[PDB]
């Protein structure tokens, strides 16, 4: 597995009660693994020695490899919002060159997955396990453009502002192309996040927002 890299995410050194020494020692280590090409996984390893916990977590994670779909190899296929227990994650698909503007743990995992450009915000509890589980839960349940074309039978067309009105066909239905236009409501019933909308409403952001940071 020379093509895979391992990264640590949390290391807890806790003392437990057992008759050997009265209070025994234990190290719980959460790690992540990935080849930077879509395959990644995480595991928890426990031992009395930190070295043993590293080995147990590292080899367990290679058995739980998710495959994450990347749009054009650099970003997620669509915005993703989810709550795993009390940890809320809100990811956004971004254009090339945007970089990884995310929680430091999400940057670590995204490099292992191979995502190069994305935005994410984490709210609620910052529990590392819930953030890792919640991240993989959302990234592994995302809908590729080809899947959407097959489900609805219609063409999936892309419109970039740097390409003008040129329609770009990114996915065509595998079977029979439909002829019923997808219903276009006059006013959508989408549930909007105040945090996303607040910006476009002209409300001042925090002094901490969009600061100059090193390349991620």
């Amino acid at each position: 597995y020379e093509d895979f890299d391992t990264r640590i995410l949390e290391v807890r050194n806790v003392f437990n009660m057992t008759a050997k020494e009265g209070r025994k020692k234990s190290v719980r280590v959460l790690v992540a693994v990935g080849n930077g090409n879509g395959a990644a996984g995480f595991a928890i390893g426990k031992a009395a020695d930190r070295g043993d916990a590293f080995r147990k977590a590292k080899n367990r994670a290679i058995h739980y490899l998710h495959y994450i779909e990347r749009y054009e190899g650099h970003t997620i296929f669509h915005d993703i919002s989810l709550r795993f227990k009390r940890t809320q994650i809100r990811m956004k698909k971004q254009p090339r060159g945007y970089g990884l503007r995310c929680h430091r743990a999400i940057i670590t995992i995204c490099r292992l997955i191979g995502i190069k450009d994305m935005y994410a915000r984490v709210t609620g509890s910052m529990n590392m396990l819930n953030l890792t589980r919640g991240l993989f839960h959302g990234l592994a349940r995302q809908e590729t453009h080809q899947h959407l074309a097959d489900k609805k039978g219609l063409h999936v067309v892309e419109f970039r502002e740097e390409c003008g009105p040129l329609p770009i066909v990114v996915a065509s239905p595998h079977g029979a192309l439909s002829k019923e236009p997808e219903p276009e409501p006059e006013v959508p019933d989408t549930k909007l996040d105040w945090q996303d909308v607040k910006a476009m409403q002209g409300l001042k952001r925090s002094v901490w927002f969009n600061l100059k940071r090193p390349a991620t």
């Binding site: 956004k92 698909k93 971004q94 254009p95 090339r96 060159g97 945007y98 453009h145 959407l148 609805k152 219609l154 063409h155 999936v156 067309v157 892309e158 419109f159 970039r160 502002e161 740097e162 390409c163 003008g164 009105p165 040129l166 329609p167 066909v169 990114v170 192309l177 439909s178 002829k179 019923e180 236009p181 997808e182």
Partner: protein
């Protein structure tokens, strides 16, 4: 007298548009600029074809050719000669009327010289001050340095002719000598190196063919159009050459033989082609390939 065809003549614009061509991928090639996340729409085959039609409508407006004009004539008019003010000033005054609703070519920009002469501002002085008070995005007050022959040659080595011309349209006026100089230098470089494909599906192809027709050097463009299987374009180019040069030996020969289609190109080769021998060879080879394969 039969009017000499113009660049904007509806007949000339038709022929120049056809030979130029269209390519939605080249016309709408991605710009290297600040980016935004793409949008996505689910569309049927009818909706997609409608969207492609709008893209072709926009590509037409994008390919609108820039004006081809003759070189402006120097402005040398003296409004007054007040000699009482001789020696009372060391520097020229330049006065610009900045009333908003006046066309820039109808504004009064005068110069009071140290000698006392009140004269109209020259063309170079007019363009500089109009940029200072009515600044145009893309244009700079002082002429950029990229237009120097050494710098332009660098852009040609990188095959950036469409850029040299897009910059020449942002900076200089169509009737200025600098505008004509750069265009005629770019068009001449394309000819020598046979780089006609660089300006296809661009707004600059028409002016290039126009320049070659007027200068009686369409040989290279015909040889290249034939080798690319664009023989309908080559025929249209020979029609435009027989339209701007009606009394030419080639135009009179085509009337005598009522030549059409591929015949027109053969007539040009024998009569007025600078390199007729090659036009026939390429034309013959095209016919052989078309006939042999199909």
């Amino acid at each position: 007298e039969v009017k000499k065809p113009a660049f904007m003549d509806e007949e000339v614009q038709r022929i120049l548009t056809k030979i130029t061509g269209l390519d939605l991928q080249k016309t709408f090639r991605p710009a290297i600029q600040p980016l935004k996340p793409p949008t996505y729409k689910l569309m049927t085959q009818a909706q997609l074809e409608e969207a492609t039609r709008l893209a072709v409508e926009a590509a037409k407006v994008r390919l609108k050719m820039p004006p081809v004009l003759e070189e402006r004539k120097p402005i040398n008019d003296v409004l007054a000669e007040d000699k009482i003010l001789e020696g009372t000033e060391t520097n020229k005054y330049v006065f610009t009327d900045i009333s908003y609703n006046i066309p820039h070519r109808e504004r009064f920009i005068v110069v009071r010289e140290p000698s006392g002469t009140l004269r109209k501002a020259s063309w170079e002085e007019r363009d500089r001050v109009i940029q200072i008070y009515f600044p145009k995005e893309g244009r700079r007050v002082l002429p950029p340095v990229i237009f120097k022959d050494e710098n332009l040659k660098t852009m040609y080595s990188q095959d950036r002719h469409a850029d040299v011309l897009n910059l020449c349209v942002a900076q200089f006026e169509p009737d200025s000598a600098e505008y004509i100089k750069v265009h005629h230098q770019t068009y001449e470089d394309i000819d020598r190196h046979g780089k006609y494909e660089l300006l296809r599906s661009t707004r600059h192809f028409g002016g290039m063919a126009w320049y070659f027709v007027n200068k009686k050097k369409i040989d290279g463009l015909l040889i290249d159009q034939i080798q690319r299987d664009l023989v309908d374009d080559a025929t249209s180019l020979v029609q435009l050459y027989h339209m701007l040069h009606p009394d030419g030996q080639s135009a009179q020969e085509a009337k005598e033989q009522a030549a059409e289609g591929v015949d027109l190109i053969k007539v040009f080769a024998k009569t007025e082609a600078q390199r007729g021998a090659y036009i026939e060879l390429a034309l013959q080879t095209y016919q052989e390939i078309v006939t042999s394969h199909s």
